[PDB]
Structures are given as C-alpha cells and as structure tokens.
Amino acid sequence: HMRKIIVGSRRSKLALTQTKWVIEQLKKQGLPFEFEIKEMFVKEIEQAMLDKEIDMAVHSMKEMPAVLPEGLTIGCIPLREDHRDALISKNGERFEELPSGAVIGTSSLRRGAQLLSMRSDIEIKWIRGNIDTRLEKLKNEDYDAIILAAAGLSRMGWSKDTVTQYLEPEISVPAVGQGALAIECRENDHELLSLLQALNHDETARAVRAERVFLKEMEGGCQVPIAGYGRILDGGNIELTSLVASPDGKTIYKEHITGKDPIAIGSEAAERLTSQGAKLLIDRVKEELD
Numbered sequence: 001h002m003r004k005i006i007v008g009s010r011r012s013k014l015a016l017t018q019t020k021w022v023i024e025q026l027k028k029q030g031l032p033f034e035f036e037i038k039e040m041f042v043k044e045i046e047q048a049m050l051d052k053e054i055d056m057a058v059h060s061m062k063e064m065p066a067v068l069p070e071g072l073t074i075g076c077i078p079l080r081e082d083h084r085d086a087l088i089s090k091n092g093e094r095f096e097e098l099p100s101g102a103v104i105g106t107s108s109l110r111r112g113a114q115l116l117s118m119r120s121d122i123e124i125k126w127i128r129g130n131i132d133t134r135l136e137k138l139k140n141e142d143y144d145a146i147i148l149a150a151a152g153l154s155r156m157g158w159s160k161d162t163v164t165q166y167l168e169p170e171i172s173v174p175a176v177g178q179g180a181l182a183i184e185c186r187e188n189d190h191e192l193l194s195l196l197q198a199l200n201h202d203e204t205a206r207a208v209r210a211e212r213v214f215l216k217e218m219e220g221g222c223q224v225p226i227a228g229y230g231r232i233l234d235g236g237n238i239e240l241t242s243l244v245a246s247p248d249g250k251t252i253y254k255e256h257i258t259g260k261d262p263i264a265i266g267s268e269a270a271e272r273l274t275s276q277g278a279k280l281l282i283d284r285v286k287e288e289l290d
C-alpha cells in the first residue's frame with residue numbers, strides 16, 4: 001500500500017540513465033515509495049505532469065525551459081557533475097594545437113561562437129547524434145574535433161582519458177545548468193517535494209539559481225549563444241560568469257558578478273549585459289533562426 005511515483009522520461013539512453021540514477025538515489029532513503037518509469041516534447045512532459053499522468057521528470061538542467069508553467073516547479077537539483085565543455089580531437093591536439101582550418105563539430109552556437117572568438121582560423125560545423133554517434137563520426141568523417149559536455153561523457157561511463165582537453169570557463173563558459181539535473185514536479189505535491197529534499201544539493205542549487213535568473217531575464221535558451229556558470233566560493237558568495245556571443249565570435253559580451261543573493265546576482269548580470277546591447281543581439285539571432 002505504497003504510493004507509486006510515476007517518473008516520465010525521454011527515450012534516449014542518456015535520459016534513461018539519468019532517470020534511473022535519480023530513482024536509485026531516492027531509494028537510498030528507505031522511505032515507503034515505489035517508482036516506475038514511463039517513456040514519453042518539454043510541453044508534452046509538463047502537460048502530463050499537470051494532468052497527473054506522471055508525477056515527476058528528470059531533465060538535464062540545460063534542457064529545461066527558462067520559464068516553467070504555473071503549477072510546476074524544480075523540486076530538486078542534485079550535486080552537480082562536471083560543468084565543463086570538453087574537446088575531443090581525432091589526433092589528440094589541444095585547442096591551440098589544432099591545425100589552421102581545423103573543423104570542430106558542434107551544433108551549439110554558444111560553443112562555436114566562443115571557440116571562434118579565440119581562434120577565427122578554425123571552422124565550426126554542425127553535427128548530430130548522441131555521444132557514441134558523434135565519437136564515431138569524429139573517427140570516420142571530416143571533423144578534426146568535437147565538443148561534448150564532460151557531464152554527459154561521465155554519466156555515459158566514458159573514461160576521463162577520452163577527453164583531449166577540458167575547457168575551463170575562461171575558454172568556454174558552459175551552458176546555464178550544464179552538469180546539473182533538474183527534477184521537475186507539481187508545486188503542491190508536498191509529499192514528493194519532501195522525498196526530493198535529501199537529494200537536493202543546496203550549493204549546486206544556489207549557483208544554478210543565479211545562472212537561471214540570468215537566463216530568464218535575457219530570454220535565453222538552447223539555440224541562443226548565451227552562457228552562464230555560477231559557483232560557490234569559500235564564505236558563501238556566488239561567482240557568476242555570464243556571456244552572450246555573436247554567432248561569428250567577433251562580438252563578446254561578458255560580465256562577472258560576485259555576491260550573496262542568487263536572484264540579485266543573476267538580475268544584475270542581465271541588466272549590465274542588456275544595457276550594452278546583448279539583448280538586441282539575442283533577439284536578432286532568434287529572428288535569424290527562422
């Protein structure tokens with residue numbers, strides 16, 4: 001006579017791996033709950049949750065919409081994985097060692113624009129596929145290197161030595177929420193929220209909250225060359241690095257804010273960058289994306 005928590009999940013191997021990881025972690029609490037996965041886009045999952053067809057969903061935080069519909073909430077952010085972008089080179093060159101005219105594979109304008117801002121003599125080309133697929137294309141096709149999230153490589157079990165070079169935020173500011181998971185549920189589901197609380201990692205949640213406020217006030221998302229990475233410093237301060245880039249890498253807006261309040265920090269970063277023209281650039285890229 002236990003409540004069975006229905007967890008909706010995307011069909012991919014990464015999404016199901018993340019979903020099962022969360023369920024296994026909640027089971028460590030030894031509380032009287034059962035768990036079941038229902039394979040299920042973001043609108044679809046949120047509708048089913050609002051419809052009570054499912055009780056919760058596990059998303060990569062960088063895939064979460066900046067704005068959740070009324071009634072839903074992020075109920076838990078667990079301990080962050082590696083936040084960094086990772087460079088994997090076919091022949092093992094670091095970024096500064098790649099040959100002139102090297103082609104780096106990524107469909108992310110955030111990633112590509114930042115790389116082009118460092119070296120405009122390389123080329124960024126679209127690529128698709130899960131990690132396994134992109135790694136195969138690196139060996140067999142006309143890419144000299146690809147960019148992947150360190151977090152996805154880790155969660156898929158790839159060795160740390162698969163990575164040629166972990167890119168620090170000073171080279172490539174990560175996508176907002178990269179390496180973090182979001183557990184979404186109904187805001188009034190106090191029983192599930194109580195179960196989720198022990199899995200929540202307050203330091204990760206506070207940093208990501210600052211990133212997400214910046215994202216929301218810039219009206220950012222996946223397709224946008226916008227980036228933000230927050231971290232907790234000794235003493236409780238959050239340091240937020242925020243960035244907006246033109247697709248060609250020749251315009252870079254960058255802002256560093258260190259303070260106590262994640263909402264104030266995120267809001268100030270957006271205010272400063274908006275005043276410099278970064279929001280106009282975001283709007284124009286959105287229009288071109290049609």
Ligand SMILES: *Cc1[nH]c(Cc2[nH]cc(CCC(=O)O)c2CC(=O)O)c(CCC(=O)O)c1CC(=O)O
Nearest residue numbers: 060062106107108110148149151152175178179222
């Ligand atoms: C918004 C966006 N999504 C993806 C693809 C993606 N989403 C989640 C992951 C795994 C890591 C995580 O959960 O943090 C991935 C795969 C990955 O980042 O390697 C992207 C990247 C598209 C690409 O580079 O082609 C993005 C855009 C962005 O990172 O800004």
